[PDB]
Design a protein around this ligand. Structure first.
Ligand SMILES: Cc1ccc(-n2nc(C(C)(C)C)cc2NC(=O)c2ccc(CNC(=O)c3cnn(-c4ccccc4)c3N)cc2)cc1
Length: 331
């Protein structure tokens, strides 16, 4: 049947939740409350989406995030525990509440890591990425604050929705060729940081960010230069590669040589040549955790809504239907 809801005001916001969610306490992320889930005995996070149907773009953003979260059924990716609305009908349908595990510990919050803990943490990012990538989805904003890590170094990829530090150079140069390996660049930047204890490319702006990248990875080779249409774009990328060249051996002095080999395959300017998540999992660096029988891919994900231009009401109707058809994961 439909649960009993109860109403309170917090941080001058009206919350209306099923009575199984008790002891709501605001945290930090927009409108988010820690809550005790009386059904399981476990603490969860309840998020009330802000102005979910305000515009076409918010409405599609609401739909997008619900469709994505409902799809994610993987150890190393945030899962959706519950979604609800107070509305008894599409007529009254206005607010959308998502329930997740309580994270409140990101990759920075947890780092001074041994080689073994870098292996396990980068292993879990790549296992999660393999999954997300297999369903034709790109994170685009992988960075330490978007990685939940509990006491036992267990890692989930999520998106709380400085980015430029972990951002692939092709995106900041506005190159044509984009692929899922923009996420691998990011993983390379995260791994480098876990090894050295400092941001690899702490640019103050996108031009500084690119100059710092090119100092390490080098000016484009003949092969890459071949794929760039514009003389002014080929001049400019060569323009930004004038800081005295650096070498990977020196930057990662004292790292496991296998880590350094894997970094050199991730931090490749030519995204056509960048190692994929599935290939990185098979690299010797992860021999202690790699199991080809336990690195699963995602079920097919229907992205055919991403290309659509629809009215607010259509986005809201599709969203309502996804709330109603939601089936909780097992206890
Ligand atoms: C527009 C949009 C579209 C899609 C996404 N999207 N994409 C992905 C993938 C699958 C593609 C990666 C995952 C997501 N979104 C999330 O991940 C996400 C959604 C909802 C929630 C709700 N919980 C929380 O906010 C939460 C839980 N612990 N804490 C916490 C507790 C104490 C202190 C600090 C924090 C929170 N603030 C959380 C996350 C995001 C945005």
């Amino acid at each position: 049947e439909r649960p009993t809801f109860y109403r309170q005001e917090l941080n001058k916001t009206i919350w209306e939740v099923p009575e199984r969610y008790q002891n709501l306490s605001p945290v930090g992320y927009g409108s988010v409350c820690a809550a005790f889930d009386t059904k399981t005995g476990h603490r969860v996070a309840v998020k009330k989406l802000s102005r979910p149907f305000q515009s076409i773009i918010h409405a599609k953003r609401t739909y997008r995030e619900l469709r994505l979260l409902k799809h994610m059924k993987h150890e190393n990716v945030i899962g959706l525990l519950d979604v609800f609305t107070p509305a008894r009908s599409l007529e009254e349908f206005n607010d959308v509440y998502l329930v997740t595990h309580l994270m409140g510990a990101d990759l920075n919050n947890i780092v001074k890591l041994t080689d073994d803990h870098v292996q396990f943490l980068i292993y879990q990012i790549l296992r999660g990425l393999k999954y997300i990538h297999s369903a034709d989805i790109i994170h685009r904003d992988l960075k330490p604050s978007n990685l939940a890590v509990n006491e036992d170094c267990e890692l989930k990829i999520l998106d709380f929705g400085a980015t430029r530090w972990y951002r692939a150079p092709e995106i900041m140069l506005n190159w044509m060729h984009y692929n899922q390996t923009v996420d691998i660049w990011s993983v390379g930047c995260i791994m480098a940081e876990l090894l050295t204890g400092r941001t690899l490319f702490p640019g103050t702006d996108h031009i500084d960010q690119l100059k710092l990248i090119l100092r390490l990875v080098g000016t484009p080779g003949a092969e890459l230069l071949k794929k760039i249409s514009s003389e002014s774009a080929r001049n400019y990328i060569q323009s930004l590669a004038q800081m005295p060249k650096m070498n990977f051996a020196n930057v990662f002095i004292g790292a496991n040589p296998l880590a350094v080999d894997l970094l050199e395959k991730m931090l490749v300017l030519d995204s056509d040549k960048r190692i994929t998540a599935a290939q990185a999992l098979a690299h010797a660096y992860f021999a202690q955790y790699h199991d080809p029988d336990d690195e699963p891919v995602a079920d097919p994900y229907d992205q055919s809504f991403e290309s659509r231009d629809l009215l607010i009401d259509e986005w809201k109707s599709l969203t309502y239907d996804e709330v109603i058809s939601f089936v909780p994961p097992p206890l």
